[PDB]
Design a protein around this ligand. Structure first.
Ligand code: ESR
Ligand code: ESR
Lengths: 125, 125
C-alpha cells in the first residue's frame, strides 16, 4: 500500500533531483510504462525513453525548485504546489505549477501531470 | 468556449460561495452529469442531486475558505491550493486541500476532486 509517507518522500525526492539536475534520480521514480503530461493539455509522453528525454531537455538549464506548501497525499495520489526558477532569454523566470502524481502498487509514479498556465509563468525581464 | 480566465473566475466564485453557504451558487457551477470526489479515493458523488447533498452536508457547519496561492488554469482544467477552517465545541481545525477542476466546453465543472489526507487536517489551532 502507498503510505502518505512514501508518496510524500517521493515528491520530496523528485523536487530534490530536479534542483540538483539528477536525471537518473528523477527517472528512477517513474514506472517503465509511466506517462508525463507537462503541461496539462500537451501531448502525453509515455515510457522511460520519452520521460528521460523530457527531463533531460528541461535540465539543460539550472533549475531552482522548491515546495511552497505541504504535500497532499491520499489513496494512491499526491498533489503539490511548488516553484521552478530559472533564467530564460535573459529574464528571471518563476513558474508556479501544481503537480499531480498517481502511484501504482510498487510505489512508482505511473502518471504525472503538471498544471500551470500562462498566468503561472512569471518572467521579470 | 472555455478559457483560463473563465476557469479562474469560476474558482473564485466557488470559494466565495462556500464562504457564503450559497448552495445554489455552488451547484450552478457544475454540469448536470458532473461528479465530486471528496476526498480522492472515496466513492464519487454523481449528478446534481448528489452534489447538492454533498455541499449541504459540507456546509452545515460554517466554513472559512481561502485561496492560499494563485489559481493554476490551463486547457479546460484548474487546480488550487486553499484552506478550510472551522470550529466545533472549542476544537479548531484547518484543512489544507488541493482541488482539481475539469471543465467541459460550455464552461461548467464536470469534475471536482479534493486531494487531502489526514496529514492535511490540522488540529489544535
Ligand atoms: C518559459 C517557458 C514556460 C515555463 C517552462 C519552460 C521550459 C521548462 C519548464 C520546466 C519546469 O519544470 C516548469 C515550467 C518550465 C518554457 C520555455 C519556453 C516558455 O514559454
Ligand atoms: C469534510 C471537511 C469540510 C468540507 C471540505 C473538506 C476538505 C476538502 C474541501 C474541498 C472542497 O472543495 C469543498 C469543501 C471540502 C473537509 C475535510 C474535513 C471537514 O470537515
Amino acid at each position: 500500500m502507498n503510505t502518505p509517507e512514501h508518496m510524500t518522500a517521493v515528491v520530496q525526492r523528485y523536487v530534490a533531483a530536479l534542483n540538483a539536475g539528477d536525471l537518473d534520480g528523477i527517472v528512477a521514480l517513474f514506472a517503465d510504462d509511466a506517462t508525463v503530461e507537462n503541461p496539462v493539455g500537451s501531448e502525453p509522453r509515455s515510457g522511460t525513453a520519452a520521460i528521460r528525454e523530457f527531463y533531460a531537455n528541461s535540465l539543460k538549464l539550472p533549475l531552482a525548485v522548491e515546495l511552497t506548501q505541504e504535500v497532499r497525499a491520499v489513496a494512491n495520489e499526491a498533489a503539490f504546489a511548488f516553484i521552478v526558477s530559472f533564467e530564460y532569454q535573459g529574464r528571471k523566470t518563476v513558474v508556479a505549477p501544481i503537480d499531480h502524481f498517481r502511484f501504482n502498487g510498487a510505489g512508482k509514479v505511473v502518471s504525472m501531470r503538471a498544471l500551470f498556465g500562462e498566468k503561472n509563468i512569471h518572467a521579470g525581464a
